[PDB]
Amino acid sequence: MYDWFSEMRKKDPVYYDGNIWQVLSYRYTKEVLNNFSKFSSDLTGYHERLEDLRNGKIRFDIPTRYTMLTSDPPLHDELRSMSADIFSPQKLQTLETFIRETTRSLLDSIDPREDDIVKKLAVPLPIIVISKILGLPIEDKEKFKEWSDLVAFRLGKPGEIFELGKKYLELIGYVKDHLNSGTEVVSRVVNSNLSDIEKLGYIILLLIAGNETTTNLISNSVIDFTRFNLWQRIREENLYLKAIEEALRYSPPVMRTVRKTKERVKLGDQTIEEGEYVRVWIASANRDEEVFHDGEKFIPDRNPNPHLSFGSGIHLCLGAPLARLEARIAIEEFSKRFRHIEILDTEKVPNEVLNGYKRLVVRLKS
Numbered sequence: 001m002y003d004w005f006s007e008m009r010k011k012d013p014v015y016y017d018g019n020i021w022q023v024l025s026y027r028y029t030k031e032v033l034n035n036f037s038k039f040s041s042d043l044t045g046y047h048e049r050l051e052d053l054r055n056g057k058i059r060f061d062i063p064t065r066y067t068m069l070t071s072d073p074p075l076h077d078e079l080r081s082m083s084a085d086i087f088s089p090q091k092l093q094t095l096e097t098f099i100r101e102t103t104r105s106l107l108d109s110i111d112p113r114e115d116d117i118v119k120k121l122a123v124p125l126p127i128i129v130i131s132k133i134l135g136l137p138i139e140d141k142e143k144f145k146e147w148s149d150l151v152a153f154r155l156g157k158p159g160e161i162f163e164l165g166k167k168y169l170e171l172i173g174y175v176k177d178h179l180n181s182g183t184e185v186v187s188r189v190v191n192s193n194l195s196d197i198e199k200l201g202y203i204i205l206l207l208i209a210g211n212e213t214t215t216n217l218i219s220n221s222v223i224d225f226t227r228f229n230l231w232q233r234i235r236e237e238n239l240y241l242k243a244i245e246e247a248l249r250y251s252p253p254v255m256r257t258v259r260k261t262k263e264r265v266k267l268g269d270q271t272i273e274e275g276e277y278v279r280v281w282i283a284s285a286n287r288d289e290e291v292f293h294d295g296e297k298f299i300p301d302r303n304p305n306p307h308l309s310f311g312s313g314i315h316l317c318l319g320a321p322l323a324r325l326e327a328r329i330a331i332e333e334f335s336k337r338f339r340h341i342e343i344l345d346t347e348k349v350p351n352e353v354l355n356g357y358k359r360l361v362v363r364l365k366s
């Protein structure tokens, strides 16, 4: 749909399809994201139940509807300030040895003759690192893996209620069971004026928000570097940092995000009435030719690279520095372990928002 995308960007970067409004241009998708005032993220009834939550009135509810993600300032900023430095430069500088050692061990388990790197490398790494960071017992990998499906970006589909409930019952219990044996990060949350529910949500957010996305970043990277035969250049020119930024732009783990107009607003040449949901196509903004010359091309050394794969504005991905650091250590250690990589088989996860692979079978020559 990147062609329809290029088409619409030219003719209708802010279009209405009957039900929802969609924004495909870079200038306008960025505008939406940065103007939280007109385009609110208060889409799960958090702002409406804050008081009753803090009142103790609301006692039970799906905890995931109350996290910084689905909230506007000040609430958002108050919640966010509690973990603002969790992925700070020095902190990441220090996890480096852990991340690299961890990726190297994961690589050590790969059978070059033929293996799936999604299963052996892409999935575990982020989970293992976030547990370390959050202080949540890693001996619960198989479960963290399952609950990672609950990430907000993913939307619903028929007959999933019983499955989701089950994952939800276990996930919550796990959190409840570990709320006090975690790092400063969670303690601060646990020891705040947040309701019991919001703390639950806050904790689940930090736990699962970057698993599937970071995994996808790693998978999509391996794919693009391979299909575009850039492994040699990347190693030679050391374009790891730049190439992962291009992978993010070209192959975004999250294709889009959503907002709701908190009022009647004119975006470009259109007037989006109050209360309208607005689809922000991150994938399309990333291809915007006005901003990204030769956007249809994968330029491994593209610089600069102002993509919106982590968003923009106040909700700009909290884990961005971490996702970047993890994918880059994974891509480097992977690239130094094989002479040549051959994609033998793939399986793509089915979702219009989440974009990556369920399976990535390859053959490596050490």
Ligand code: HEM
Pocket: 041, 068, 069, 070, 080, 205, 206, 207, 208, 209, 210, 211, 213, 214, 217, 252, 253, 254, 257, 258, 308, 309, 310, 311, 312, 314, 315, 316, 317, 318, 319, 320, 322, 323, 324
């Ligand atoms: C490379 C993979 C990743 C991608 C592409 C991604 C993408 C995004 C995007 C698009 C947003 C903004 C959503 C919006 O504006 O509605 C976001 C928010 C967020 N991300 Fe990620 N993410 C990734 C990795 C991570 C990691 C590793 C973590 C770590 C736990 C994480 C934590 C968060 C949090 C907490 C927010 C909400 C912050 C706020 O609302 O201010 N993300 N992410």
